Amino acid sequence: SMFLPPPECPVFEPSWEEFADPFAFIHKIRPIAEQTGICKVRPPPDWQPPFACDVDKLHFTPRIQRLNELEAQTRVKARDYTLRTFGEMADAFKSDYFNMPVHMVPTELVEKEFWRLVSTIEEDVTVEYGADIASKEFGSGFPVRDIKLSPEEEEYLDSGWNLNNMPVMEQSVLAHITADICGMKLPWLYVGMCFSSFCWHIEDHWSYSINYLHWGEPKTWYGVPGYAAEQLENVMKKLAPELFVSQPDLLHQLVTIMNPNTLMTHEVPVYRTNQCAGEFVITFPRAYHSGFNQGFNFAEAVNFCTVDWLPLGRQCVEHYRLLHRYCVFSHDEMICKMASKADVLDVVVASTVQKDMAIMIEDEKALRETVRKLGVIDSERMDFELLPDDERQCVKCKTTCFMSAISCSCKPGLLVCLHHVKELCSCPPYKYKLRYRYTLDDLYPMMNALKLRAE
Numbered sequence: 001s002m003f004l005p006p007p008e009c010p011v012f013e014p015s016w017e018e019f020a021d022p023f024a025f026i027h028k029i030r031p032i033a034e035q036t037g038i039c040k041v042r043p044p045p046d047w048q049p050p051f052a053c054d055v056d057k058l059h060f061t062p063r064i065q066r067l068n069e070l071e072a073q074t075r076v077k078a079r080d081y082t083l084r085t086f087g088e089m090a091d092a093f094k095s096d097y098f099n100m101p102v103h104m105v106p107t108e109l110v111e112k113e114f115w116r117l118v119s120t121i122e123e124d125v126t127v128e129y130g131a132d133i134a135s136k137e138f139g140s141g142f143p144v145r146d147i148k149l150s151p152e153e154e155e156y157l158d159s160g161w162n163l164n165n166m167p168v169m170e171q172s173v174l175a176h177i178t179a180d181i182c183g184m185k186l187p188w189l190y191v192g193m194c195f196s197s198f199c200w201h202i203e204d205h206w207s208y209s210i211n212y213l214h215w216g217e218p219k220t221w222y223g224v225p226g227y228a229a230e231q232l233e234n235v236m237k238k239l240a241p242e243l244f245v246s247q248p249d250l251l252h253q254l255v256t257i258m259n260p261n262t263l264m265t266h267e268v269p270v271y272r273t274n275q276c277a278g279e280f281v282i283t284f285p286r287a288y289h290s291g292f293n294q295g296f297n298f299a300e301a302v303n304f305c306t307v308d309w310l311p312l313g314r315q316c317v318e319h320y321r322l323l324h325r326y327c328v329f330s331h332d333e334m335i336c337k338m339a340s341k342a343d344v345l346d347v348v349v350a351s352t353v354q355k356d357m358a359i360m361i362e363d364e365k366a367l368r369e370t371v372r373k374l375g376v377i378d379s380e381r382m383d384f385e386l387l388p389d390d391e392r393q394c395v396k397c398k399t400t401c402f403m404s405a406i407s408c409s410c411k412p413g414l415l416v417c418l419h420h421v422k423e424l425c426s427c428p429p430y431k432y433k434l435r436y437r438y439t440l441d442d443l444y445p446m447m448n449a450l451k452l453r454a455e
């Protein structure tokens, strides 16, 4: 009556045969899990990657978090903690909050209380949360090559489910990107405490994510399937329109806490789960998710992109354009990079890239015909991939240009994409130049190499 828990998301317990290949498994469960947005994966009982670190030498500065439903928070960014001192703070907080030992506090009660707490104006509870990229100063919870490693660690070094591997494996198309995009290739570490929260969001470029809880108390999740993404946004926009004002850049994205019952009242499907230590949660493309930690814990997560994802990635960039949102990378640049490496691509990958590339080329063909009819005549080849991102964003829609753009000597350095030829300046279009990475004639042999590779 006060909080009605959403239905549970799917839980999978793969055999060791099934577990051997994460991408095969994820493809397999996808028909089920994409209907719920998130799912949980329990590894085989003896898959137990060793965790080891010194709690006194690991330092980080956490973000302070107010817990108010519908209040704006920024998706990225008062004191430094070691893992030990954060833990001591975290345990004391929960212990004092409930006047109980921490293991005795029912997960159902922490959940109820979380939603009461964020709802109540009179309550002004603040907590702290660590969110930080895998670095030399704070490394992965999974074993990596560096130290002399134990046989136990060597067992899990090359695991597909070791989250350092998944990104740079042949089957995350993100692995092929040469643009560093560190925020999307490197794992992130999350040190949680009771009620510390992640707001409703989807991943950049509508990518997958995979989250492993190394140890500690559970992480509570809510997820919405990709097909219902715009439904959720419509609900949120009505209740919190300030979150939907356009952002000056990626460092100013606004997100918020919102009761899943509010979504369920508006017929948005929502699923929940308690992720416990040693379990994975996978989020699917464009699947909204949010949650909070039950207590002191330690999680690790990374984004990835399968061949299943490529056409959604193209759709995402089109969606970003319509919203004037910045891109993390150029999707077309990634496609062409892969084409230029057709001989070493996996064959199913080559086949899928070929299909996306065919759409890209046909769309590009139409756009160039349109701008020619606008009276843009001069053109010059341009290696867009050499420009810093902030030097190749469309003035109007902020898209990262790669296939082509329009420039005018009138405004040096400024570019518009071919959708916004009329937004560059007031000179007549005969003064403009079409800057292009490839002629259409360059592009067809590139696609053809993919075809040969694919057979």
Ligand SMILES: O=C(O)c1ccnc(C(=O)O)c1
Residues within 6 Å of the ligand: 190, 197, 198, 209, 211, 219, 289, 299
């Ligand atoms: O704080 C987390 O555990 C979490 C969960 C899902 N997603 C994110 C994220 O930042 O993408 C963070």
Ligand SMILES: [Mn+2]
Residues within 6 Å of the ligand: 201, 202, 203, 209, 289
């Ligand atoms: Mn996320």
Ligand code: NA
Residues within 6 Å of the ligand: 067, 068, 069, 117, 118, 119, 120, 121, 122, 123, 124, 125
């Ligand atoms: Na509150």
Ligand SMILES: [Zn+2]
Residues within 6 Å of the ligand: 394, 395, 396, 397, 398, 399, 416, 417, 418, 419, 420
């Ligand atoms: Zn544009």
Ligand SMILES: [Zn+2]
Residues within 6 Å of the ligand: 408, 409, 410, 411, 425, 426, 427, 431
């Ligand atoms: Zn001009």
